[PDB]
Amino acid sequence: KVFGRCELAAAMKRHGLDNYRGYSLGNWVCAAKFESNFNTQATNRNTDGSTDYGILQINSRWWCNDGRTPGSRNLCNIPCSALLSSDITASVNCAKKIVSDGNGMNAWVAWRNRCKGTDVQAWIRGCRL
Amino acid sequence: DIVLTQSPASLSASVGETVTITCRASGNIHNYLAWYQQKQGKSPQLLVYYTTTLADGVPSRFSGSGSGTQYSLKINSLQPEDFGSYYCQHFASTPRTFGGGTKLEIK
Amino acid sequence: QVQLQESGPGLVAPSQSLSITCTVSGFSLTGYGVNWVRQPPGKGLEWLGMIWGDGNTDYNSALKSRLSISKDNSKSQVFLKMNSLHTDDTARYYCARERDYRLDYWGQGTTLTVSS
Questions:
Q1: How distant, in Å, are the alpha carbons of A72, A109, C98 from that of A48?
Q2: Domain that holds residue A73
Q3: Annotated catalytic, A52?
Q4: What domain range is C1 assigned to?
Q5: Nearest residue of chain C to residue B1 (CA atoms)
Q6: What sign does the CA torsion over C18, C22, C23, C28 have?
Q7: Catalytic status, residue A7
Q8: What CATH number has the domain bearing residue C116?
Q9: Which residues does the UniProt record annotate as the domain Ig-like (chain C)?
Q10: The CATH number of the domain where A93 resides is what?
Q11: B65: part of which helix (H) or strand (E)?
């Protein structure tokens, strides 16, 4: 499922991501855009048994268990295929786990390199939410 | 441009008193509103952002509330170091603008 | 430690330009915007413009035509270039860092006076 930017934004606001740990809502939408292109079923095979999953591309070596990755930690205590869903509750709950403080968004390489410092609010402006 | 109407212009209060400073936006700013305090001959200092979040280090006697177009900064039990000026600024889009300021002074 | 330090000419006339410099430290310009704000004597704050981490710029609509903001990421410097000066440009000029829709760190401000 590929979300429209406003739809994704309203979903994320519903799940408490707006101003979560001081991160404005646009940060989250921008990160989704660059990580999975808003596709809830995105997957990405890394150079190590690792694989990134769903809309926020959560890693199988540290956050969700796929049981196919050399050394899971499953810190989110969730199966990676839970992340590959139309409903974003799991992805969001794990993301909140990942972002423990105000610098937590660095968890997403695309956000740090393509969102941090830009007008991320641009992604949600004009969205009814 | 979204303009902000801040009031009152000046406030005379005693320590221990509670005071409210409002900022009304000419347009909906969607909670993107910050407050700053500027003390005699110092740069402004961030107090509150996104309407309600205190900045790090800011005492909890400061609370912001708002939504839509009317915003308020409340200071409960004001302390000697609270006197000075206060400004609100929006971040709803560019150009950003500030409120005209409120001078909080000793009664 | 996050630091913003402004450096300007101090006094200028309606016939020259005006470039103020904002030398930052404790953070990369690629990751944060820097706003320019001024405060006329005994007046409130006035927003001038800003440059985002990506180099895009936005300006106060009224002063947009007299302003130009640029930066050198490697020198950790941001520049406010202003022309067609008026005596009403006399103010304390501040560069402040923007971190996700709030100005969290402000420089000390440089005082500029515009003469005849």
A1: 12, 17, 37
A2: 1-129
A3: yes
A4: 1-116
A5: C61
A6: negative
A7: no
A8: 2.60.40.10
A9: 1-96
A10: 1.10.530.10
A11: strand B62-65
